[PDB]
Amino acid sequence: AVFYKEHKLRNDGLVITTNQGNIRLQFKSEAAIEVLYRADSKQLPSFALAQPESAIKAQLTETENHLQFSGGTLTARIQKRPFAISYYRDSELLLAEESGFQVKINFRFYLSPGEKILGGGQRILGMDRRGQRFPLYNRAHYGYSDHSGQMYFGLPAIMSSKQYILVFDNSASGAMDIGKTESDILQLEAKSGRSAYILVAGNSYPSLIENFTQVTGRQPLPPRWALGSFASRFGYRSEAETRATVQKYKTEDFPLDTIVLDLYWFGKDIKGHMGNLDWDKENFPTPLDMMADFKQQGVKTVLITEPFVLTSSKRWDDAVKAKALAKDPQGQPKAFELYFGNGGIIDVFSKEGSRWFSSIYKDLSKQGVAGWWGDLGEPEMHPEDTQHAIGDADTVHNAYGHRWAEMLYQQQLDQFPELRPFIMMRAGFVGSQRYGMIPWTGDVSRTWGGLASQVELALQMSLLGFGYIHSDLGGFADGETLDKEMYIRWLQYGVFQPVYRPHGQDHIPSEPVFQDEETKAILRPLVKLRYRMLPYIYTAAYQNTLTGMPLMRPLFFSDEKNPALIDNKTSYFWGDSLLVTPITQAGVESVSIPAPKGVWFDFWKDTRYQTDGAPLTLPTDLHTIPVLVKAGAFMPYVPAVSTTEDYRSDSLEIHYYADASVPLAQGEIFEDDGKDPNSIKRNQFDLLTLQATHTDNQLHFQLARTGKGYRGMPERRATTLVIHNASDQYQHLDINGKTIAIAQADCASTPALACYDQERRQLQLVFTWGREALNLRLHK
Ligand SMILES: OC[C@@H]1[C@@H](O)[C@H](O)[C@@H](O)[C@@H]2N[C@H]12
Ligand SMILES: O=C([O-])C(=O)[O-]
């Protein structure tokens, strides 16, 4: 029995008193609200909110049976007796409390009939998680395939078909029950921790996500090199082996930006050395030279680190002496068994642990290390009587990796303020993206099932803040011999997902350079294609920094009024323009692609398809996976380079997919120095825009550049524009009012300024794109 007793406003927040205690409501923006129950009591702070203290001005009104607290899109409606808060966008009901808050921590809400619920972070259960119940406890799932209710990186959040996001702002061992136990009840639970939730609303999925990342944190632009080719295995055993691998990329003519070193960099065995956090000199005798020698070839070095210091490690006595480790309740360093051996866990929640760990990252970063891999932050083993500075293991568990990232991010920004940190981690919390976190999906099995789950995982993480979620390309766990077809399919799909990092246990090679002749002839041009497409990918990255828009988008974005599309986890958008359908079984001879209504082109073959709703059937081959381009797309390319350190946009090649069904289209290309964390804030960029206007008798392109530019920015780019599906009736072109004839022969064989290829239906324009506006007009 809960009822309203009294309220007041203090500092823009509404504090309500019931018979059971105090409740604080603060709008964190016009469409986001933090609801803190037990507000009177001391509890852990918010982890999910980028600005925990903020509270924007809201409107309060009172009636007999209700209060109403409104931010301008989001309204909280507070029923007095019995006490129940519900949430409205306009006057559409988003979400209503059932019994709401109780005791242990427990929140109960009604689900509407037909409401679909995405969320939970990494699970393999189906896109719509309604009807499921699962824990909120980050945990390894070694060798997963086609099913999981619990893995490395859960999120205590959901996204509904009613276009709200709900966050349980609580770091503790808990559970979510999405209308499983009771069909119309969403229940959130925890053993302890903060008793708060956050509701975010939107008028569309993009703007929900913009609103969500507004209050939880925007990912800062990673360094362009994170969009490149990684060499990684578990693991290079020696400096010789690592140098031989960088060399193999060179001698095999595969692009390579970054080599990743796993745990053998600090000791010769898997067990017993962890916490050394220093070079194993018997096997890495000259590491500063190694890294400098690699940097001369434009290659970065990334090192694995972990939260555990073993008692067998060289740093045990020192970590104990500095009070860097988590303690038992008695006050001693807590030691426990891990796979790796007997050890403790660095307390990133304390000042002492944070300083000690940070000093180590500083020193290695001074030596040459460009980036950082933080493995096992679930934490992988975390006994319940472990005590951190702010709470026990079960209370802080799901926020450990999150704070680890914060610690490392701040440290790297402090040491290198002119560089963008690279932080790759296995576990975090809502908002960990504001510390640069780049998550991967853990120890996936080397099976088709492992590959077939990657899109579901990626989309689930992308929707709730994590743009750079990716997989171990080719698969990681077990196997006894390479499954060549699965490997190829996985590295194909790789091109069209966020981070190009094949990784696997080293009894089978993960790196494409170590594959047979057929596999390399298939994958070499695709890895090059990933580099030629950097303008497309880096521009989606820019948009993610700006608005939260994930790089991978689900099919369901294509039609917000068709909730059945929510179930699709086999076709997705890579940026605005490409609909990708990975092949996830052996021997598949054709696919049916549920392309939205409109016009689509085969990316590889240029074939044009129109569809009014029905799916398209495309045949498959071993050299590609099915990718369709949306009519009206501008696909930008630069020439392939070995390393993003050599990246230039002096030469652009842009492909426009014309169709009269799209009378107006746009694209952009975001260019900056690829490394400056302040490029966007300070406008040190070159933002190229392109607008096509397509009428019955003309096709008009308007080109422009904004921003203040950056150092090394080309003033003039040689630009080849290729118009696919171009009309054969264009007689003339003018460029900024100057008329040029269109050639109809020998387009591939003359330095033609405008040439129509009648066999391919492509019109090619070659011109100089300088700083001033440019207008290209084709007319029949
Ligand atoms: O460090 C060894 C190895 C690493 O290669 C994987 O990527 C991790 O998820 C897991 N900890 C196991
Ligand atoms: O699209 C056009 O304008 C045509 O096909 O001739």
Side-chain angles (χ1 to χ4, degrees):
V2 197
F3 51 86
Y4 168 81
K5 277 173 74 173
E6 181 247 303
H7 69 271
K8 56 153 153 44
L9 288 168
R10 219 178 263 189
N11 309 332
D12 296 299
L14 177 65
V15 184
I16 297 173
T17 304
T18 66
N19 53 305
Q20 293 296 336
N22 281 0
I23 309 174
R24 192 185 68 202
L25 290 77
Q26 293 175 321
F27 279 92
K28 300 294 139 164
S29 69
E30 314 288 47
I33 195 174
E34 186 199 32
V35 179
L36 178 58
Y37 280 79
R38 310 180 306 167
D40 55 276
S41 70
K42 285 261 193 200
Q43 48 196 319
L44 283 179
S46 168
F47 285 111
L49 292 165
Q51 285 172 322
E53 323 295 80
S54 66
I56 67 94
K57 167 179 182 140
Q59 181 204 302
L60 171 52
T61 78
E62 170 153 38
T63 62
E64 188 79 43
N65 303 322
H66 292 90
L67 299 182
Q68 277 208 7
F69 195 45
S70 276
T73 42
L74 182 60
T75 298
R77 170 180 176 77
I78 297 157
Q79 178 185 263
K80 287 165 156 170
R81 282 189 179 283
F83 188 77
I85 311 164
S86 58
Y87 300 89
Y88 294 80
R89 167 199 49 238
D90 289 318
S91 58
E92 278 187 39
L93 178 79
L94 296 185
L95 179 67
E97 284 180 350
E98 182 248 18
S99 51
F101 181 58
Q102 280 182 302
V103 190
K104 302 207 176 183
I105 292 180
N106 189 287
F107 284 117
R108 285 168 62 95
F109 301 87
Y110 289 109
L111 291 169
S112 309
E115 181 174 13
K116 296 187 139 283
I117 304 290
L118 305 104
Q122 296 169 1
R123 321 285 165 171
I124 309 160
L125 295 171
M127 291 289 286
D128 177 1
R129 275 89 203 269
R130 186 156 182 184
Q132 298 294 321
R133 157 182 187 77
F134 46 73
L136 295 178
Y137 190 86
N138 291 343
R139 190 195 169 201
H141 188 167
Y142 178 88
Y144 75 91
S145 180
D146 64 4
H147 189 267
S148 186
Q150 179 178 27
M151 45 190 305
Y152 304 88
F153 195 161
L155 293 168
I158 52 148
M159 172 184 300
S160 164
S161 42
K162 287 190 181 303
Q163 309 193 327
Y164 65 86
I165 288 162
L166 176 67
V167 180
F168 183 33
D169 198 352
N170 171 276
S171 61
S173 177
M176 201 170 277
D177 187 305
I178 310 178
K180 194 272 197 305
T181 299
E182 298 172 58
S183 83
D184 68 329
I185 301 286
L186 170 65
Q187 188 168 302
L188 313 175
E189 330 165 8
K191 298 199 198 303
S192 55
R194 183 184 184 83
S195 57
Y197 64 83
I198 299 152
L199 191 289
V200 187
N203 64 43
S204 73
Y205 293 111
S207 59
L208 171 56
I209 290 162
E210 178 164 33
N211 294 348
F212 173 75
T213 49
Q214 183 180 6
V215 298
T216 64
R218 296 259 166 72
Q219 184 132 16
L221 201 57
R224 182 149 51 195
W225 68 250
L227 304 180
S229 164
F230 292 76
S232 181
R233 52 175 54 202
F234 169 27
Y236 304 112
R237 309 312 187 82
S238 71
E239 169 169 359
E241 208 180 79
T242 309
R243 283 167 179 284
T245 303
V246 168
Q247 175 68 350
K248 196 81 181 194
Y249 274 78
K250 292 295 137 81
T251 67
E252 296 288 331
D253 187 34
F254 278 78
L256 177 70
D257 259 88
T258 307
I259 193 164
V260 186
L261 285 168
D262 204 326
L263 52 56
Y264 301 102
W265 80 259
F266 58 70
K268 85 165 161 67
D269 324 281
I270 290 167
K271 294 176 193 153
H273 308 283
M274 188 172 297
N276 282 3
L277 290 154
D278 207 8
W279 298 95
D280 169 16
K281 295 288 184 81
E282 266 163 38
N283 296 297
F284 292 74
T286 60
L288 276 62
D289 286 348
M290 176 189 83
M291 298 181 286
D293 288 347
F294 297 167
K295 190 200 211 283
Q296 258 168 248
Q297 308 185 36
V299 176
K300 280 67 64 191
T301 310
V302 172
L303 306 183
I304 202 176
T305 54
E306 300 96 340
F308 307 102
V309 182
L310 303 180
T311 65
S312 48
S313 89
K314 301 162 191 192
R315 296 203 192 260
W316 177 258
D317 291 5
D318 196 68
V320 170
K321 170 163 154 167
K323 311 194 151 161
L325 314 175
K327 290 169 164 149
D328 67 19
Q330 310 189 323
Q332 302 166 359
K334 176 70 177 160
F336 46 89
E337 303 300 331
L338 293 109
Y339 174 45
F340 304 106
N342 185 252
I345 179 166
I346 291 161
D347 187 16
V348 298
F349 298 104
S350 59
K351 66 167 181 154
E352 300 83 7
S354 291
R355 186 206 296 114
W356 186 83
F357 204 10
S358 295
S359 152
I360 289 158
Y361 281 114
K362 184 161 185 196
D363 175 10
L364 292 155
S365 296
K366 191 153 140 75
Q367 294 169 45
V369 179
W372 287 109
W373 179 17
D375 187 24
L376 318 177
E378 288 69 40
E380 182 168 89
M381 179 84 272
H382 205 197
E384 72 178 289
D385 68 314
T386 307
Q387 308 297 320
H388 295 268
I390 69 171
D392 56 24
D394 279 4
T395 306
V396 303
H397 186 78
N398 294 322
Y400 180 92
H402 177 89
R403 164 67 200 147
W404 183 11
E406 178 188 46
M407 184 209 78
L408 183 56
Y409 180 81
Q410 296 163 326
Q411 183 282 308
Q412 287 282 294
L413 280 188
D414 210 272
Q415 180 172 23
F416 302 123
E418 302 309 319
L419 294 177
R420 296 162 181 183
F422 184 78
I423 290 159
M424 187 173 83
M425 277 183 172
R426 213 163 74 167
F429 194 71
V430 170
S432 299
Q433 75 277 3
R434 77 203 185 237
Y435 308 124
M437 192 182 274
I438 292 178
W440 88 104
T441 64
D443 297 349
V444 70
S445 56
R446 287 164 153 146
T447 64
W448 290 101
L451 172 54
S453 305
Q454 293 313 306
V455 169
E456 173 183 354
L457 292 165
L459 295 173
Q460 290 281 331
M461 296 296 291
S462 300
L463 290 171
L464 297 175
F466 296 91
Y468 302 90
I469 184 62
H470 62 284
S471 62
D472 288 356
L473 306 177
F476 177 87
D478 305 316
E480 288 177 16
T481 201
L482 185 77
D483 187 327
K484 174 172 158 184
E485 195 184 337
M486 181 201 77
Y487 180 95
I488 292 164
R489 265 55 176 101
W490 207 322
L491 272 73
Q492 289 165 325
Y493 154 64
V495 171
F496 306 94
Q497 54 87 74
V499 173
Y500 203 90
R501 186 182 63 77
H503 178 64
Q505 297 169 341
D506 72 8
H507 65 283
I508 299 170
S510 30
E511 307 93 324
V513 301
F514 292 124
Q515 305 303 339
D516 69 14
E517 292 303 330
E518 180 177 14
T519 299
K520 295 178 295 186
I522 293 172
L523 298 176
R524 186 184 294 97
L526 289 175
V527 176
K528 291 184 189 191
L529 175 62
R530 163 73 167 206
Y531 278 68
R532 300 192 300 97
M533 290 179 77
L534 283 165
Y536 185 73
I537 304 172
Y538 193 61
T539 299
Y542 164 72
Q543 281 303 327
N544 180 252
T545 287
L546 275 188
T547 68
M549 181 64 55
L551 285 65
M552 300 176 56
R553 311 89 192 264
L555 184 54
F556 78 82
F557 281 22
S558 73
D559 186 358
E560 297 196 347
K561 317 205 146 159
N562 183 0
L565 305 180
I566 291 179
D567 304 320
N568 194 298
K569 70 206 155 54
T570 46
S571 282
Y572 66 92
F573 296 98
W574 178 237
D576 301 306
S577 297
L578 298 179
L579 179 60
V580 181
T581 305
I583 299 304
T584 66
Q585 326 172 355
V588 173
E589 287 184 47
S590 78
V591 293
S592 173
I593 301 169
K597 190 177 170 197
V599 181
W600 292 91
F601 298 88
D602 185 343
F603 182 59
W604 315 104
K605 293 192 163 147
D606 215 19
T607 322
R608 171 180 185 281
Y609 299 95
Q610 195 160 21
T611 172
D612 219 38
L616 306 173
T617 295
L618 277 81
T620 60
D621 47 70
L622 186 55
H623 59 266
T624 61
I625 57 153
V627 178
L628 303 180
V629 200
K630 183 162 182 178
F634 288 94
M635 301 301 300
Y637 309 90
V638 295
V641 299
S642 275
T643 170
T644 59
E645 299 307 323
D646 299 341
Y647 175 91
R648 298 291 292 163
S649 55
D650 296 302
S651 170
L652 268 175
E653 179 180 348
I654 301 183
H655 288 236
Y656 179 67
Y657 292 75
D659 195 86
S661 69
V662 181
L664 166 39
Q666 301 196 341
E668 45 162 54
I669 306 171
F670 173 88
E671 283 297 346
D672 71 1
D673 71 14
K675 59 168 188 197
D676 182 359
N678 299 119
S679 64
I680 295 161
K681 180 206 176 219
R682 306 224 182 106
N683 301 293
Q684 321 275 15
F685 62 78
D686 192 17
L687 179 56
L688 291 60
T689 51
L690 298 101
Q691 178 185 273
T693 306
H694 189 157
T695 61
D696 293 0
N697 295 313
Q698 102 173 42
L699 174 57
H700 172 269
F701 298 92
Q702 190 155 299
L703 278 50
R705 291 158 68 180
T706 58
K708 302 172 163 173
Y710 59 97
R711 215 171 315 183
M713 182 196 61
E715 283 291 314
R716 278 161 316 266
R717 297 186 173 86
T719 306
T720 307
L721 179 67
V722 189
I723 304 158
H724 297 238
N725 189 46
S727 177
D728 62 20
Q729 298 285 127
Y730 294 133
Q731 303 269 326
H732 80 275
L733 168 67
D734 66 76
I735 305 186
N736 288 339
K738 184 177 172 61
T739 295
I740 288 162
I742 299 164
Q744 310 278 315
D746 309 331
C747 304
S749 64
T750 51
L753 277 280
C755 197
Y756 183 68
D757 180 332
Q758 69 196 1
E759 293 81 12
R760 298 191 179 79
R761 298 190 44 76
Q762 289 176 9
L763 202 158
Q764 172 185 257
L765 308 184
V766 184
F767 61 87
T768 296
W769 188 346
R771 260 216 182 178
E772 292 67 27
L774 189 45
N775 301 111
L776 313 178
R777 198 183 95 218
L778 296 158
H779 207 124
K780 309 182 181 182

